[PDB]
């Protein structure tokens with residue numbers, strides 16, 4: 759679990775969005791596993807606007823942060839799960855690192871701010887949904 763809180767927006771994994779997220783929907787994209795909802799309180803986070811390919815992510819299944827080298831955002835095949843059919847997920851970045859079900863929502867940060875959130879994983883890989891192209895989160 760986990761979310762990004764920026765300005766009057768909350769960014770979550772679309773597959774983990776609550777009834778309240780859907781009732782306050784701003785934008786969602788099943789191909790990216792992202793959903794953004796509106797909030798009344800001002801957020802705590804800032805978003806990176808960069809091309810970093812290294813950073814640090816929070817891994818809730820280890821209660822620890824780990825450094826990662828990750829690929830540029832791209833279209834990646836993701837196997838069927840209870841949440842989605844087998845499909846290509848867009849704007850996804852892969853890295854070698856631990857992840858297990860329950861870790862989605864962990865934040866990836868570089869020196870510039872928030873890069874994205876954990877969205878996929880398996881067998882020593884971890885995949886992050888990029889948010890750096892969503893320029894409207896800042897205004």
Ligand SMILES: CSc1ncncc1CC(=O)N1CCC[C@H](C(N)=O)C1
Pocket residue numbers: 773791836839841842847857858859860861862876877878879880881
């Ligand atoms: C950190 S998630 C994880 N980690 C390790 N092993 C399995 C997983 C589970 C996983 O990859 N998915 C299930 C939930 C929907 C995800 C999606 N974005 O389509 C795909």
Ligand SMILES: [Zn+2]
Pocket residue numbers: 806807808809810868869870871
């Ligand atoms: Zn950066």
